[PDB]
Design a protein around this ligand. Sequence first.
Ligand SMILES: Cc1cc2nc3c(=O)[nH]c(=O)nc-3n(C[C@H](O)[C@H](O)[C@H](O)COP(=O)(O)OP(=O)(O)OC[C@H]3O[C@@H](n4cnc5c(N)ncnc54)[C@H](O)[C@@H]3O)c2cc1C
Ligand SMILES: Cc1cc2nc3c(=O)[nH]c(=O)nc-3n(C[C@H](O)[C@H](O)[C@H](O)COP(=O)(O)OP(=O)(O)OC[C@H]3O[C@@H](n4cnc5c(N)ncnc54)[C@H](O)[C@@H]3O)c2cc1C
Ligand SMILES: O=c1ccn([C@@H]2O[C@H](COP(=O)(O)OP(=O)(O)O)[C@@H](O)[C@H]2O)c(=O)[nH]1
Ligand SMILES: O=c1ccn([C@@H]2O[C@H](COP(=O)(O)OP(=O)(O)O)[C@@H](O)[C@H]2O)c(=O)[nH]1
Lengths: 385, 386
Amino acid sequence: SDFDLIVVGSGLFGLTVAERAASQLGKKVLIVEKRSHLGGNAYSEAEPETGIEIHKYGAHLFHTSNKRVWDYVNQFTAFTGYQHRVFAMHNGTAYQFPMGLGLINQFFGRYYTPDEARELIKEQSAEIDSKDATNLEEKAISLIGRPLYEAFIRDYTAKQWQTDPKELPAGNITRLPVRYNFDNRYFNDTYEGLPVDGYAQWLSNMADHENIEVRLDTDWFEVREDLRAQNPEAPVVYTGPLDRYFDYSEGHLGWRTLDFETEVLNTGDFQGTPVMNYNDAEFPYTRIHEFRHFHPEREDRHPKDKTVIMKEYSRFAEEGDEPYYPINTPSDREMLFKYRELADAETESGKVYFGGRLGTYQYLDMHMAIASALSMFDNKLVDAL
Amino acid sequence: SDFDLIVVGSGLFGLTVAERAASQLGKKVLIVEKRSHLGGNAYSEAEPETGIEIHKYGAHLFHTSNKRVWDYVNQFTAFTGYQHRVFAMHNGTAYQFPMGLGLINQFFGRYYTPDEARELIKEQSAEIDSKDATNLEEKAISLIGRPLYEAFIRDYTAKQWQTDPKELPAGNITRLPVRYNFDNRYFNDTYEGLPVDGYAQWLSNMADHENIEVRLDTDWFEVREDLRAQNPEAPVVYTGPLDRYFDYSEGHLGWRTLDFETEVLNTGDFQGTPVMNYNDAEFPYTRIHEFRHFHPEREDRHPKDKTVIMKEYSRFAEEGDEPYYPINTPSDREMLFKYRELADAETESGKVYFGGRLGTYQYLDMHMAIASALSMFDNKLVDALK
Ligand SMILES: Cc1cc2nc3c(=O)[nH]c(=O)nc-3n(C[C@H](O)[C@H](O)[C@H](O)COP(=O)(O)OP(=O)(O)OC[C@H]3O[C@@H](n4cnc5c(N)ncnc54)[C@H](O)[C@@H]3O)c2cc1C
Ligand SMILES: Cc1cc2nc3c(=O)[nH]c(=O)nc-3n(C[C@H](O)[C@H](O)[C@H](O)COP(=O)(O)OP(=O)(O)OC[C@H]3O[C@@H](n4cnc5c(N)ncnc54)[C@H](O)[C@@H]3O)c2cc1C
Ligand SMILES: O=c1ccn([C@@H]2O[C@H](COP(=O)(O)OP(=O)(O)O)[C@@H](O)[C@H]2O)c(=O)[nH]1
Ligand SMILES: O=c1ccn([C@@H]2O[C@H](COP(=O)(O)OP(=O)(O)O)[C@@H](O)[C@H]2O)c(=O)[nH]1
């Protein structure tokens, strides 16, 4: 008892809202986490044989242009100067990526100036304007033209979504920078880097406040009925799956899940870069991570003749999988609305708020989760405390 | 005796020694600069029509792994987070550069793995071991193999030096990182970036001390007899050309000089990157600079539909020219040794010290000029000014 707030989930959304209540409002918070560790998908740990820091839940690369979010996270960890770059493997060649003069030179066979390249892509993309694009395929072609779409977007998306590119959200592809220069940074944000002391350390520092206690290995849906009887005093922030909150009363929301197969190899360097995208259908995995390259400043502590790689696979979320991505087909989006009604209803009736990637069925990055958490705290939780 | 110290030349070397005497030893310093501005080849200024900062003596990019140098320069200017990357234009294609998996893929036509690339380059470099490579051609081939050498080094080098690569220093090519991964940073140093407020501001801050007076438009060899009458006590640090100092007694050292064509173009972006190398003999210039891409953090101040470029041309230094590079052929290294002897004698006899790219005939980057000057101040001038 004595708890002012209950947060369901110790992911970044759950941790920010809890940390803000604790240090800004001085309220005692308890976070209920189902897993054996803090941090949700942002969690990382060292690989036993090599000591290399692994994102066991997918490559986690922090980037933001939100100054307020940047200053905030920098309270809990320093960040390296790492800048994410991705190469795209297609028909036996590693391509500069995303769209820029480098990829354009490599794929079309000669150098195009910025002006010449703008003209080239204008021609190949003419079949649809960006204003008229309502899904992933129309939008992609509109931004990068037909041939680049068919060569670098089609098969990849098929593997990542196993879904008709004509019903997936346009916003999925606008995640990637589209450029007419040689800049091949995978993100275009003001601030980015990796936690200097690793993710795990970062996330713990966040939860480290004395008005916060974490109960790991604990399922909310089990302990809720008494715990909030022990404390009808505390509001609840739920960052678990939405459709699961209401026991699939309206059905199952479409989610994608990922699998990670880790391999320790007898070479110091497998692919010479942190992430290689596999854009061809013949390769079952979407990309390969080589984690030693995420921290070149730890070179002296990495083994000289071993490396850990991880092949990443995508499939539909089955019950028992962690959902990683919302699919948000139009068919999905309807079901989503019905749950939103229910959700709205629950927050007033039962003082339960719905946040985070899983809580709102939204394709959120870390900095987006944190911003959305900051918004909920300032706009809602300040009142209800 | 209005001056405890006289410095010839206001390049980074000269500004460093002057600033240290001024702030660390409380000594009055005179810097004689021959040019109309201070800072030597690191000088920059805004282009009138566009306002874009131009490095007027060739693109200047600061990089170092020397922590003492880094902390020092950061007293006079902050630096951006910019990282230099260079692309190499060859047979109508812009290649990732210097050697990495990117260049190897593009030039050889398929992806090579790090291990495969190591084996591929091991084969192509078999004709010479790096241990036995004693000139530029041998060293380049030993490091990146014959085919990459002939496509990306030979012709560029020909334009830039106009000298048999078998007579050029091996050290010229080892300036470039040789990698078996996808990292295409042109430098591999711990610290790098651009002066946030430009080079001119940085260099002015260095010279901005009440113990320092700068005389521009002044040639040391013309004012020398008078200046050394009015302050016969003061040591002199000379950072001008070594062989000119002794009136070419031992002959002419080989030097290269540069010429630049600067052009304002009616487009917002000419080449999508700050430096494009032109590795083919068919282009008379060695590279093209597009200065706006050095400062993307100034995007809001850049014109939307204009850009300034600069084409760089190389030739031998003749009597009217400022020398930009030492050539250091074996014949040059002989002559140099003789000038070193003279210089040594002069330092004893006339208390004249010799420093910097021109003063010592060395292929020095900015951080090396500054490192060598910090060293000279501590190790020679503290003593000499006691
Ligand atoms: C493969 C992948 C790569 C990514 N890469 C990046 C990137 O490069 N850069 C970036 O900025 N973002 C990235 N992200 C996004 C980032 O992982 C998430 O957006 C962020 O973690 C979202 O925060 P969240 O709190 O909403 O989600 P979550 O981390 O999923 O929070 C859920 C937590 O609540 C717990 N929980 C669920 N149900 C219960 C329950 N019933 N009881 C108790 N606890 C429960 C879960 O165990 C989990 O720990 C990536 C995501 C993935 C999947
Ligand atoms: C095209 C080019 C690009 C370069 N790019 C980089 C880079 O990207 N990064 C990097 O770290 N370094 C770079 N450098 C190297 C850089 O220029 C040198 O490190 C630096 O200029 C050396 O400083 P310095 O003081 O020793 O010599 P200088 O800069 O040559 O200074 C010598 C000064 O002495 C003056 N002087 C000569 N004679 C007299 C006289 N008789 N009387 C009075 N004054 C005289 C000269 O006018 C000059 O101002 C580049 C050089 C060139 C040519
Ligand atoms: O090589 C690529 C990279 C991305 N995408 C598309 O762009 C979306 C977002 O890409 P991101 O790299 O942002 O995927 P995440 O890291 O979020 O899984 C993916 O879902 C794909 O549909 C693609 O088709 N090919
Ligand atoms: O595309 C290139 C780049 C460099 N070099 C060789 O490497 C030396 C050093 O190159 P840098 O880029 O350091 O030249 P700087 O910028 O000092 O003129 C040059 O003199 C050439 O001999 C070359 O042959 N081709």
